[PDB]
Design a protein around this ligand. Structure first.
Ligand SMILES: N[C@@H](CCC(=O)N[C@@H](CS)C(=O)NCC(=O)O)C(=O)O
Ligand SMILES: [K+]
Ligand SMILES: [K+]
Ligand SMILES: [K+]
Length: 242
């Protein structure tokens, strides 16, 4: 029912009036904002998306998102939450069905640790994307430590997904970087050796089939095109899907 690909709004664009639907201030290619989409999808919460041009930001953005970042959710008129993990934790507390976070505090903590474990991945991706020349071997090594740790958590838990037979917070909150890893899979510093990472590669295949993931997937040729702008220092085209 939801259109993920309405125009990204720029300075001079009007602010659509609140209409009752929970609203996400998003940008289609933002992995951080993707966390909020995944959560909303998995929990089957009705919502609407307002896309934001991050190069030429709407004047009224900081009104909704103090740090001028995405995502932000608006849960009522002029009442907003931002910071991706903050938004997801709010939705999990207020919408009880399909709980993303473990109820047991210890298990909850482990999930958050796992998410933190993906920082080196988040880091390598943004470096390769925007500061590619500065990418050294500590970055690449840290990234591999990151993958090792995550795979091992999955191995130890023995389940299909980090959070069980259905993906949960840990899965969804790291997923966007795995979605992106797929498009970096022919840069040599990212490609995964299939013996070492066969369990992780299998998990990624299964994630692609989760309906919260699949309905929001970016076709890989589109994502590569998008990334291309950055590596050339071009002005982003936010409308490739529209
Ligand atoms: N810690 C924040 C970070 C989110 C973030 O970095 N959003 C980026 C987009 S990928 C952004 O809005 N950058 C604003 C800019 O272009 O200055 C979160 O988890 O929500
Ligand atoms: K980014
Ligand atoms: K960033
Ligand atoms: K390309």
């Amino acid at each position: 029912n939801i259109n993920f690909n309405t125009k990204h709004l720029r300075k001079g664009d009007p602010l659509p009036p609140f209409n009752g639907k929970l609203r996400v201030y998003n940008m289609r290619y933002c992995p951080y904002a993707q966390r909020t989409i995944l959560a909303l999808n998995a929990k089957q919460i009705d919502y609407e998306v307002v896309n934001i041009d991050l190069i030429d930001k709407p004047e009224w953005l900081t009104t909704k998102s103090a740090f001028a970042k995405v995502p932000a959710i608006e849960i009522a008129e002029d009442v907003t939450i931002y910071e991706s993990l903050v938004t997801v934790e709010y939705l999990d507390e207020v919408y009880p069905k399909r709980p993303l976070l473990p109820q047991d505090p210890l298990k909850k903590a482990l999930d958050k640790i796992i998410v933190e474990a993906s920082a080196p991945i988040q880091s390598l991706f943004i470096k390769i994307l925007k500061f590619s020349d500065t990418v050294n071997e500590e970055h690449v090594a840290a990234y591999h430590k990151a993958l090792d740790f995550i795979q091992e958590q999955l191995k130890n838990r023995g389940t299909v997904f980090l959070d069980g037979s259905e993906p949960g917070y840990a899965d969804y909150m790291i997923w966007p970087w795995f979605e992106r890893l797929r498009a970096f899979a022919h840069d040599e510093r990212v490609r995964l050796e299939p013996s070492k990472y066969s369990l992780l590669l299998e998990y990624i295949d299964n994630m692609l089939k989760d309906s919260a993931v699949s309905q929001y997937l970016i076709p890989l040729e589109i994502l590569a095109k998008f990334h291309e702008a950055y590596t050339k220092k071009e002005r982003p085209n936010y409308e490739l899907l529209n």
